[PDB]
Design a protein around this ligand. Structure first.
Ligand code: NA
Ligand code: NA
Ligand code: NA
Length: 444
């Protein structure tokens, strides 16, 4: 009796700038994150993805590594600056890498899930305004259409955007991520142009009518808890919940922005980008939703720079990210989507994982027992989601290997495989061996 069906997809995930390296090889030009990493202080210790895990050169070994673990699906992102290193200038050599990457995956029985945009916007695009420029909808559409045309016979599962909350609010309001702006109004406009660009790709994808091929989007979602019973903390929680979750779930799946947040934001910034025709493109029917889940937020009333909600530390065990380990919110979010937003639409966990202080023992092993127990606890919640009727199709662990964790640089290790960056040596962590056994047995 299986807890995960034979059709269930046990997978792992990466992103192009986090693992590839070869940042200027074969015609790749800079992305906003190459640029951001070279601005003083914007990435911890001035780390950058010049080399990363060198997955661009080592991909055959990395696919062979995944085969030997039993991995059934691999979620990766395609580097826009590799494909169009300049506006209107296609680079065949860049496509060739994803063609041979994909071919190696298929020969090794691994199903490719390709993320179209995972934050590595071409610098030429940002120099024209980037996501603040409404014309990015066409540039993104042409980019997506090129991928569908050249790879659509071999990649059958497509994700338009990874975590637009990060590309918008974290990049243009908080400013921790590239391009690092700090203007709420720009963040709101960016969030709309991202969703509109996603809708353009979906429209193009449907026009092509490719056989047995599916499209969706990936959202990082949390569950928000008020710190107290008070009405002021409940209001703070509604703000945080709409800030993180509802601002993207409502337009995608209801066809409108959450009206309370339209009202709230409207006291501080312009919200005049909303209109009916844009929202119809944004709310097109998807084949699946990918969920990125890591932690919950406990908020109380106040304002410390962001909005009118202050996140607090409730006092339980956290990862090296400072993120609380709270597995039950994974079930609560999945069930909330089933009840209020996605109904019986296929759902995927496109990212879940944890960063811990991994050390290689003198015998060559990594005993990351905290990561093993982390993943055990969350797969148990996925198993409970399935038992209660949830349409969960797969689970992508973040990450296959230690990589470049954005503004943290290489200081945070998410992999089930350890990477010694001086030698690029890969070392299976105990969590990888645990994952391999979970895939073989399919019971937890
Ligand atoms: Na890189
Ligand atoms: Na740098
Ligand atoms: Na949909």
């Amino acid at each position: 009796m299986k807890d995960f069906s034979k059709d269930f997809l046990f997978g792992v995930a990466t992103a192009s700038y986090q693992v590839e390296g070869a940042y200027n090889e074969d015609g790749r030009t800079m992305s906003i994150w190459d640029t951001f990493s070279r601005q003083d202080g914007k990435v911890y210790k001035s780390h950058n993805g010049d080399v990363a895990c060198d997955h661009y050169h080592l991909y055959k070994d990395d696919v062979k590594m995944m085969k030997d673990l039993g991995i059934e699906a691999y979620r990766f992102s395609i580097a826009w600056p590799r494909i169009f290193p300049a506006k209107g200038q296609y680079n065949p050599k860049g496509m060739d890498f994803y063609k041979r990457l994909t071919d190696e995956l298929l020969k090794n029985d691994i199903k490719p899930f390709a993320t179209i945009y995972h934050w590595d916007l071409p610098q030429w695009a940002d120099d024209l305004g980037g996501w603040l420029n409404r014309e990015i909808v066409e540039w993104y559409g042409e980019y997506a259409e090129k991928l569908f045309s050249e790879l659509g016979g071999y990649i059958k599962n497509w994700i338009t955007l990874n975590e637009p909350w990060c590309s918008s609010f974290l990049s243009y309001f908080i400013g921790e991520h590239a391009p690092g702006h700090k203007d709420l109004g720009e963040a709101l406009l960016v969030s709309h142009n991202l969703l509109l660009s996603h809708g353009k790709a979906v429209e193009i994808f449907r026009g092509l009518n490719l056989d047995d091929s599916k499209i969706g989007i990936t959202l990082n979602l949390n569950e928000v808890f008020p710190a107290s019973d008070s009405d002021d903390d409940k209001v703070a929680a509604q703000i945080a919940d709409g800030f993180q979750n509802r601002w993207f779930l409502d337009p995608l799946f209801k066809g409108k922005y959450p009206q309370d947040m339209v009202e709230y934001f409207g006291k501080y910034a312009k919200v005049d980008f909303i209109n009916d025709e844009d929202l119809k493109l944004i709310s097109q029917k998807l084949d699946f939703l990918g969920v990125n889940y890591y932690t919950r937020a406990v908020v109380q009333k106040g304002n410390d720079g962001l909005l009118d909600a202050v996140q607090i530390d409730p006092g339980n065990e956290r990862t090296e990210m400072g993120w609380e380990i709270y597995p039950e919110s994974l079930y609560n979010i999945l069930m909330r989507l089933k009840r209020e937003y996605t109904y019986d639409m296929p759902l995927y966990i496109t990212e879940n994982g944890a960063a811990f202080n991994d050390v290689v023992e003198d015998d060559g092993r990594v005993h990351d027992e905290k990561r093993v127990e982390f993943l055990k606890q969350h797969f148990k919640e996925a198993k409970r989601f399935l038992n209660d009727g949830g349409n969960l199709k797969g689970y992508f662990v973040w990450s296959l290997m230690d990589n470049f964790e954005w503004a943290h640089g290489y200081s945070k290790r998410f992999g089930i495989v350890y990477v010694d960056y001086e030698t690029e040596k890969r070392i299976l962590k105990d969590s990888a061996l645990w994952y391999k056994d979970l895939i073989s047995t399919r019971t937890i």
